[PDB]
Amino acid sequence: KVFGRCELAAAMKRHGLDNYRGYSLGNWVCAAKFESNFNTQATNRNTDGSTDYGILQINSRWWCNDGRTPGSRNLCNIPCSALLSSDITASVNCAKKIVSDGNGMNAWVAWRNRCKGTDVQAWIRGCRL
């Protein structure tokens, strides 16, 4: 499913992401925009053989099991395919563990390079939250 900007903002808010670990809602919407262009079905293969999955492009080397990333940990305890669902619950629950890991949202390259330090509030402007 390809989410609308405000539609995703509302879903993320409902799942407890607004201000989780100190990151305002605008940060999560910005990260999703640049990681997957709001598409739950996005996948991207990395040079190391791992693959990024879903709305928040969660990596198979540490977070989920895709059966083809040799020697990977499955820290969120879920198959990577679960992250491509139209229901963002699994992606949200796993993202919460990722962001608590120590590097915060810097774990997401697109957030660090395109969202960090920008006016993230613009991503939720106009939405009925």
Swiss-Prot record:
Binding site for substrate: D101
Catalytic reactions of this protein: Hydrolysis of (1->4)-beta-linkages between N-acetylmuramic acid and N-acetyl-D-glucosamine residues in a peptidoglycan and between N-acetyl-D-glucosamine residues in chitodextrins
Keyword Hydrolase applies: yes
Residue ranges occupied by any C-type lysozyme domain in the UniProt entry: 1-129
Coiled-coil ranges (or none): none
SUPFAM superfamilies, sorted: Lysozyme-like
Entry's Gene Ontology molecular function annotations: beta-N-acetylglucosaminidase activity; identical protein binding; lysozyme activity
Predominant subcellular localization, coarse grouping: secreted
Disulfide-bond pairs as recorded: C6-C127, C30-C115, C64-C80, C76-C94
A Pfam family assignment: Lys
Location of the protein in the cell: Secreted
Active site location: E35, D52
Cellular compartments per GO CC: cytoplasm; endoplasmic reticulum; extracellular space
Distribution of this protein across tissues and organs: In the egg white and polymorphonuclear leukocytes.
Enzyme Commission code: 3.2.1.17
Keywords, in A-Z order: Allergen, Antimicrobial, Bacteriolytic enzyme, Disulfide bond, Glycosidase, Hydrolase, Secreted, Signal
Alphabetical GO biological process terms: cell wall macromolecule catabolic process; defense response to bacterium; defense response to Gram-negative bacterium; defense response to Gram-positive bacterium; killing of cells of another organism
Cited PANTHER family: LYSOZYME C (PTHR11407:SF28)
Family: Belongs to the glycosyl hydrolase 22 family.
Its biological purpose: Lysozymes have primarily a bacteriolytic function; those in tissues and body fluids are associated with the monocyte-macrophage system and enhance the activity of immunoagents. Has bacteriolytic activity against M.luteus.
Other information: Lysozyme C is capable of both hydrolysis and transglycosylation; it also shows a slight esterase activity. It acts rapidly on both peptide-substituted and unsubstituted peptidoglycan, and slowly on chitin oligosaccharides.
Subunit structure: Monomer.
Protein name: Lysozyme C
Organism: Gallus gallus (Chicken)
Gene name of the encoded protein: LYZ
